[PDB]
């Protein structure tokens, strides 16, 4: 039937250790996203769906730009104007474990829109949430391709 | 534009070290399927879609049964009586490298037969093509998810 669950394990690129899970599930509202990462230096860390499932590259370059299907700005997740991928930032705590749990109304399963077979990218620094294309969140840490779960 | 190239990253499971990149191209005849991977037992290995694109678990159980949009039995990929999954073995040399190259005329990228967010799984033993529901290929040495490439 209709996909109710979608998973990413990312792995780390080329002179990072950042791994984890994220999880996207179907609720009354949108998307629960729940992320579970490890191996972040402390602080905020962009947080993002990337517009190609392609993580073979030793740097994560292979994922391309934001997904973007809609060919809006970047911006915050509470923005209009944003890409579908722009996800906000994940806090990794003084140990480089970082957990986020948040309601996104804007990403989908099916469609023009759907994230499966997308990248998550997490990112050196912080998504600024300004800044055009990508918020300045610099280098890519880690990369992984969003699947169907069950 | 409609997607004419998926990528697949494959990690290890927990006790493994396989490690590798697979491509799935367009083509005049079908979807050229190219694995390039390491770190394997020398030998044949089987190599199949999974239904779930989840590589969390441990021993890559997370990714589930054959890719069985159809309802078919398990074969070998020349094969009518197959699971779109069935992707045959690929065979590691001596050092543990692994190619394979092949012209496979029932994977899409699109609809409900589409491989993208689908999991790669690549087992300890040979798929012997015969055996159901899985060809008895042992445990699972390998897990990505198949994305959308540029
Ligand atoms: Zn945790
Ligand atoms: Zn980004
Ligand atoms: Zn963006
Ligand atoms: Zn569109
Ligand atoms: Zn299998
Ligand atoms: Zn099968
Ligand atoms: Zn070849
Ligand atoms: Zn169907």
């Known amino acids: 039937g209709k996909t109710q669950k979608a998973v990413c394990v990312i ?8 791994t984890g899970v994220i999880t996207f599930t179907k609720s009354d509202d949108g998307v629960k996203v729940v992320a579970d990462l490890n191996g972040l230096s402390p602080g905020k860390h962009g947080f993002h769906i990337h517009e190609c499932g392609d993580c073979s590259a030793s740097d994560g370059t292979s994922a391309g730009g934001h997904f973007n299907p809609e060919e809006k700005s970047h911006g915050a997740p509470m923005d209009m104007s944003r890409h579908i991928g722009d996800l906000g930032n994940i806090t990794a705590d003084e140990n480089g474990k970082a957990h986020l749990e948040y ?48």
Request: hydrophobic share 35%.
């Open 103 to 150: 309601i996104d109304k804007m990403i989908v399963f099916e469609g023009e829109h759907s994230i499966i077979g997308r990248s998550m990218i997490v990112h050196k620094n912080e998504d600024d949430l300004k800044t055009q294309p990508t918020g300045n969140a610099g280098a890519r840490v880690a990369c992984g391709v969003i699947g169907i779960g069950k």
């Open 11 to 18: 792995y780390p690129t080329q002179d990072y250790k950042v």
